[PDB]
Amino acid sequence: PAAPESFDEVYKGRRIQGRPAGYEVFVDGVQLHVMRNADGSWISVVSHYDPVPTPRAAARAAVDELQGAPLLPF
Amino acid sequence: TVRKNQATLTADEKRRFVAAVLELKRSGRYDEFVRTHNEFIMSDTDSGERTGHRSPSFLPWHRRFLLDFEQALQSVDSSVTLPYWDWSADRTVRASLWAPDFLGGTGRSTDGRVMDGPFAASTGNWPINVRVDSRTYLRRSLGGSVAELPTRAEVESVLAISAYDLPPYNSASEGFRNHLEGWRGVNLHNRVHVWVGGQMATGVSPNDPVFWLHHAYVDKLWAEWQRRHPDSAYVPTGGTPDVVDLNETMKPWNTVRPADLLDHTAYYTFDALEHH
Ligand SMILES: [O-][O-]
Numbered sequence: 320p321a322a323p324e325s326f327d328e329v330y331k332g333r334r335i336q337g338r339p340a341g342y343e344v345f346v347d348g349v350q351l352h353v354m355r356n357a358d359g360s361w362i363s364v365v366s367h368y369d370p371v372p373t374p375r376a377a378a379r380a381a382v383d384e385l386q387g388a389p390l391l392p393f
Numbered sequence: 394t395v396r397k398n399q400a401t402l403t404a405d406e407k408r409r410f411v412a413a414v415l416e417l418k419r420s421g422r423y424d425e426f427v428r429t430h431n432e433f434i435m436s437d438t439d440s441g442e443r444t445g446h447r448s449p450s451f452l453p454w455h456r457r458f459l460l461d462f463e464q465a466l467q468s469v470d471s472s473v474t475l476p477y478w479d480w481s482a483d484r485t486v487r488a489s490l491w492a493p494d495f496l497g498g499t500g501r502s503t504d505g506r507v508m509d510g511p512f513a514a515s516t517g518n519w520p521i522n523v524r525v526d527s528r529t530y531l532r533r534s535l536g537g538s539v540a541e542l543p544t545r546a547e548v549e550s551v552l553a554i555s556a557y558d559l560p561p562y563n564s565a566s567e568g569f570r571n572h573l574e575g576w577r578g579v580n581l582h583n584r585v586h587v588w589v590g591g592q593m594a595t596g597v598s599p600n601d602p603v604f605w606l607h608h609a610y611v612d613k614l615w616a617e618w619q620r621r622h623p624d625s626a627y628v629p630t631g632g633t634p635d636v637v638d639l640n641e642t643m644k645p646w647n648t649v650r651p652a653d654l655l656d657h658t659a660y661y662t663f664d665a666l667e668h669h
Pocket residue numbers: 446586598
């Protein structure tokens with residue numbers, strides 16, 4: 320049950336960050352709601368029906384979804 | 394009240410449904426349904442309190458949420474009822490559902506923007522206000538993020554499951570509810586959200602009017618499951634932390650229990666529903 324490792328990268332032009340808190344993700348400094356499923360997969364509020372294996376994968380899915388759009392604070 | 398397959402609506406019934414939905418939007422009532430759904434999907438967790446999603450109450454909760462929305466539509470036009478979208482049958486972008494006289498089509502590829510139908514941003518009649526990002530226009534990418542809607546044979550495999558739900562009563566469960574929801578197995582409800590794309594793939598998925606027609610067909614599949622399994626009923630039946638038991642009330646209403654929602658015929662019937 321320990322949390323995933325933190326991460327920080329530029330993905331498709333945007334900075335994505337993740338850190339244990341139970342886990343927080345940011346896209347260009349704006350927090351992105353993410354959640355962990357029982358089986359260890361992740362989703363985000365902009366991909367909430369679509370499990371992906373890791374919080375970085377959920378952050379990257381959000382950047383894909385956003386097509387350049389600023390995230391609004393949650 | 395009869396809920397009909399969208400594919401069977403007359404031109405006048407499509408006109409009246411669209412107008413009732415647009416009036417709920419204009420008056421500000423529609424956006425509060427979007428807001429309620431997003432609040433629950435953000436709060437429902439597998440290891441904590443869970444009511445609208447990823448839990449046995451997924452089905453009675455959406456049944457009651459859809460009843461709230463249908464009653465709001467009927468306050469504008471009493472002849473309107475919620476239609477349902479059988480995505481196992483109407484599975485391509487050529488479906489009449491997606492015609493400009495009903496819901497409009499897929500979004501253009503540059504930015505996902507829906508360009509036709511009554512809910513296109515250009516009409517001025519469908520601002521996206523309850524949102525997670527700067528974009529204020531309806532978006533869709535039908536078939537963009539997943540290649541196929543569920544097939545009838547897949548649906549039948551799930552309908553054959555006899556247990557309603559099973560411990561631990563969350564996204565890891567075996568049983569009918571979680572296979573219909575889609576977190577395990579060949580994936581019915583979650584995959585349809587992914588297939589539509591745009592706001593339908595997000596926590597603010599009621600921003601797309603197709604939300605209602607999707608969940609009205611999920612709700613019909615629960616009624617079909619009950620006819621296939623008269624010896625099975627909602628579980629759990631008491632004393633379960635974090636989960637809505639059969640006789641416990643559900644948020645946000647607080648005054649209704651899963652037990653009050655098991656028999657849909659108290660509220661509506663379907664155009665056709667298989668017998669046992
Ligand atoms: O549940 O959307």
